[PDB]
């Protein structure tokens, strides 16, 4: 046991806390404690207790910072063992998981959480001090980012409830129509949500899991059904819930951001989860339209153009790919031109399509077999096309090979900045497993770097942003969403563009599309 001591603790103490709910902005602070030396300090009354701390230092610091901010206190997030653990091995994503792996237990008791933080920090910090690159990431990117996220989560984003309500009825209507059609193609009404009734109808005149249904695209009814499922999912996952997630004390929505969740270092969101809102789908766009600016403010949305290809270009050092970007020429057009040995002027739109497909196909995994189906071209030609590609960008092939070799030898792969991911499976004899590792192997450096760049961008942008009355609100994919006063907008945009594009010196220029509007959808123009 440790020695009890009265509140407050000397500065530099590690904080432990317990919430009544997982969402910081909605939870009630039940317990608060601090540890330093061999002592523990338990706060008599949690809320007031916060004011005695100059820095939330410990496990899940950001979360506490959020609660404090909603209470009008500027309590900054400090060192957090989670970040260190994550940097050591991206597998470390939850506090319970980390504790177990490193000798501690995660309990629902403030004091204990306070002690655990101290212990962990010392332990992991030692292990990190020898890693030049990782220490850099922790200090220059990770830690500072905590503050940023804290503010984002706390400020939140305004929603157009009126619009949401309306949209709900529209989709409900489309659903009814689809349902009607299904009945027509079935000859008799029935419950689409009922397994038994569905199965019978299918077997009724057809010869037979969403995958199963997808494969059974033989009768139009199956198509229409899947559409029904889709709309239903979206309506209940994004349209209907949103209004209910508006915090009473702010009038805005507070989506959660996690810093140590994805396997590649990309930020993830929850409640909702922007990541899964349909990209360029009529409905998806309509949902984005719900996110609006404050009365007298505007939304500035910045997006990175094909960052992954530019990153690849840099990591491979492929003269051709590099030239495409340095020359500012259309990537897909040039790809086609190369693959088919035809000058720009004669690029058939179908060639462009093929190129576009391959380009993306080589990024996410190595879309080999998929090519046939997605292109409706015979097997042989598909392989040839792939060959033509690497023939045009040799160094990309060389890079992929090198990456895997290094992976097998060292046991891990790393992003441009040094972030690492261990890949033991590259030596697996089981096909599917080894192939999975292989995808991950080259996906990691490309995606990881894209993530790192964005994070670096944010970190160094925040201070300057705050200098003007501007706010950082959302981050999804390779996109940032800001909020700024009507008269300041244009200026803020100009700044954001520069900062982002010049975040780090690449052999390829970085480009950012910028849009300003009253709502997210309008902004993206």
UniProtKB/Swiss-Prot annotation:
<dbReference type="GO" id="GO:0001882">
    <property type="term" value="F:nucleoside binding"/>
</dbReference>
<keyword id="KW-0378">Hydrolase</keyword>
<keyword id="KW-0808">Transferase</keyword>
<keyword id="KW-0548">Nucleotidyltransferase</keyword>
<comment type="similarity">
    <text>Belongs to the DNA polymerase type-A family.</text>
</comment>
<feature type="region of interest" description="Polymerase">
    <location>
        <begin position="118"/>
        <end position="525"/>
    </location>
</feature>
<dbReference type="GO" id="GO:0003677">
    <property type="term" value="F:DNA binding"/>
</dbReference>
<keyword id="KW-0540">Nuclease</keyword>
<keyword id="KW-0239">DNA-directed DNA polymerase</keyword>
<dbReference type="GO" id="GO:0003887">
    <property type="term" value="F:DNA-directed DNA polymerase activity"/>
</dbReference>
<comment type="function">
    <text>In addition to polymerase activity, this DNA polymerase exhibits 5'-3' exonuclease activity. Unlikely to have 3'-5' exonuclease activity due to absence of a 3'-5' exonuclease domain.</text>
</comment>
<keyword id="KW-0235">DNA replication</keyword>
<keyword id="KW-0234">DNA repair</keyword>
<keyword id="KW-0227">DNA damage</keyword>
<dbReference type="GO" id="GO:0008409">
    <property type="term" value="F:5'-3' exonuclease activity"/>
</dbReference>
<dbReference type="GO" id="GO:0006261">
    <property type="term" value="P:DNA-templated DNA replication"/>
</dbReference>
<dbReference type="GO" id="GO:0006302">
    <property type="term" value="P:double-strand break repair"/>
</dbReference>
<keyword id="KW-0269">Exonuclease</keyword>
<protein>
    <recommendedName>
        <fullName>DNA polymerase I, thermostable</fullName>
        <ecNumber>2.7.7.7</ecNumber>
    </recommendedName>
</protein>
<keyword id="KW-0238">DNA-binding</keyword>
